[PDB]
Write a protein that binds this ligand. Structure first.
Ligand SMILES: CC(=O)N[C@H]1[C@H](O[C@H]2[C@@H](O)[C@@H](CO)O[C@@H](O[C@H]3[C@H](O)[C@@H](O)[C@H](O)O[C@@H]3CO)[C@@H]2O)O[C@H](CO)[C@@H](O)[C@@H]1O[C@@H]1O[C@H](CO)[C@H](O)[C@H](O)[C@H]1O[C@@H]1O[C@@H](C)[C@@H](O)[C@@H](O)[C@@H]1O
Length: 171
């Protein structure tokens, strides 16, 4: 099977698969909802950004969110979520990254993302509800990696993708 890249799309990912996103621009990298109690997204902020309110298109709504990135040279992914249709978005985990890659996976009812600072970022779980039915819309090219191959996804998130579109053959 070919892990990617695949172009931006919407689907409801099966459990036990990492989605590895390779965004080009700051903004909304991906979003997802179960239409009941979770509306989630990952934001990307470029290096060297003072506290500033930016507009983000989340599920078609214009949402103002105050962000910052005090890293002088690394990009910052920010996990955000709300827990009701009209609730406020809250910022949770962050990933400080020199590779510009982030990832998410549904497993065991939890939603895993990477957090920390590359090259030592690790998957951490969100477990405030059962996330198995949350879908995704990606706004960047992405790769699909099984949990059985989680070590590949950790390696890419922390150290970068290969220089050729052959991740299928490269570990
Ligand atoms: C395998 C492990 O120890 N941690 C991996 C974790 O596995 C946990 C999930 O299956 C989770 C789902 O609910 O269940 C955990 O069991 C917990 C329950 O979470 C908790 O509710 C209950 O009360 O207590 C039990 C305790 O037994 C599982 O342990 O899944 C993560 C997402 O895949 C994964 O990232 C994590 O992998 C480990 O990560 C740590 C760093 O935090 C180290 O790097 C480990 O080396 C790494 O394990 C390695 O990767 C995992 C995916 C698997 O391939 C391992 O065989 C491998 O050594």
């Amino acid at each position: 099977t070919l892990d990617g890249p695949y172009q931006p799309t919407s689907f409801n990912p099966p459990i036990n698969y990492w989605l590895l996103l390779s965004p080009t621009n700051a903004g909304v990298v991906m979003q997802g909802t179960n239409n009941t109690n979770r509306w989630l997204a990952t934001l990307l902020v470029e290096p060297n950004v003072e506290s500033t309110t930016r507009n983000y298109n989340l599920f078609g709504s214009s949402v103002d969110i105050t962000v910052e990135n005090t890293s002088s040279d690394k990009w910052k992914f920010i996990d955000v979520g709300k827990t009701s249709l009209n609730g406020s978005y809250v910022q949770h985990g962050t990933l400080i990254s020199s590779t510009k890659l982030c990832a998410a996976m549904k497993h065991g009812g939890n939603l895993y993302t990477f957090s920390g600072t590359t090259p030592n970022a690790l998957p951490k779980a969100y477990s405030t509800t059962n996330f198995d039915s949350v879908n995704v819309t990606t706004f960047a090219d992405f790769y699909i990696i099984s949990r059985d191959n989680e070590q590949k996804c950790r390696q890419y998130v922390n150290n970068g993708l290969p220089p050729i579109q052959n991740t299928r053959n490269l570990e």
